[PDB]
Amino acid sequence: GAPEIELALRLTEYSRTLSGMESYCVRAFADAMEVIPSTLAENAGLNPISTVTELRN
Amino acid sequence: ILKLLEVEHPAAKVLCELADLQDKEVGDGTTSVVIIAAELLKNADELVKQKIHPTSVIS
Amino acid sequence: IEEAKRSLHDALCVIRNLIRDNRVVYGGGAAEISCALAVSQEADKCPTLEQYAMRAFADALEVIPMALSENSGM
C-alpha cells in the first residue's frame, strides 16, 4: 500500500495541476488510495493516522 | 462439564474445545485454559477499547 | 444612510489602511487560490500529522470566492 499512499500524494498535486472542475474530483480520487493502507496501518495495529501522514510526505 | 454442558455461543465453543484440546494432551491446565482466555480477554478487554489495537499487545 | 454612511466609513477605513501603507492587493479567488496553491502544495512539506490540517486548510483559503462564484452565478 505504499504505492497507494505514494501516488495518493502525487495525483492530488497533479489533479491540482489539471485545474478544471475535475481537479477537486481527481484530488478526491487521488486521496482515496490513502485509506487502504490506513485500514492496513489500522488493522496491523497502532496508528494509521500517523502512518500515511509521513509516508505520503 | 463443558462437554456435558452444551455450548450456546461460538465463544465458549472453542473453550470446551481448547479445554479438551488441552485435556486431550494432558488432563491439567484444562478447566483453567477456559478462564485464562477470558482472563486475558478481560486483560485486553478495555485495552482493545482503550487506544489499543490488541495486535500490538497480543503479539 | 445605512448605505452611504458605512460606505464612506469603510472607504475612510480602507483609505486609512492605504494612506498609511498603500498596498494594492487582489482578491476574488486570485489570491484565494494561489495562497492555497502555495499552502496546499506546501502543506505536504511538513511530515507532521497536521500535514492533513495543512492540506484541508488551504482549500478553505479558496472557499471564500467559491461562494462569490454562485453569487456571481458561475
Q: How many angstroms separate the CA atoms of B1 and C28, rounded?
A: 78
CA C66 to each of CA A34, C52, C56: distance values in angstroms, whole numbers, following the listed order: 27, 21, 15
The Cα angle at residue C49 between residues C43 and C51, in degrees rounded to 5: 5
Q: Which of C41, C44, C59 has the most A C-beta neighbours within 10 Å, making it the best mutation to test the interface with A?
A: C44
The answer to whether C68 and C29 are in contact (CB under 8 A) is yes
Please name the method used to determine this structure: cryo-EM
Q: What's this structure's resolution in Å?
A: 8.7
Q: Which of C33, C35, C45, C49 has the most A C-beta neighbours within 10 Å, making it the best mutation to test the interface with A?
A: C49
Structure-block grid coordinates of residue C29: 479567488
Chain C environment of A48 (Cβ under 8 Å): none
Q: Nearest residue on chain B to A41, judged by CA atoms?
A: B53
Q: How many angstroms separate the CA atoms of C37 and C59, rounded?
A: 9
Q: How far is CA B32 from the centre of its chain?
A: 9
Dihedral, A32, A34, A36, A40 alpha carbons, nearest 10? -160
C39-47: long-range contacts at Cβ-Cβ below 8 A with a sequence spacing of 24 or more? Answer: C40/A16, C41/A13, C41/A16, C44/A9, C44/A13, C44/A56, C44/A57, C45/A57, C46/A57, C47/A53, C47/A54, C47/A57
Q: How many angstroms separate the CA atoms of A48 and A55, rounded?
A: 10
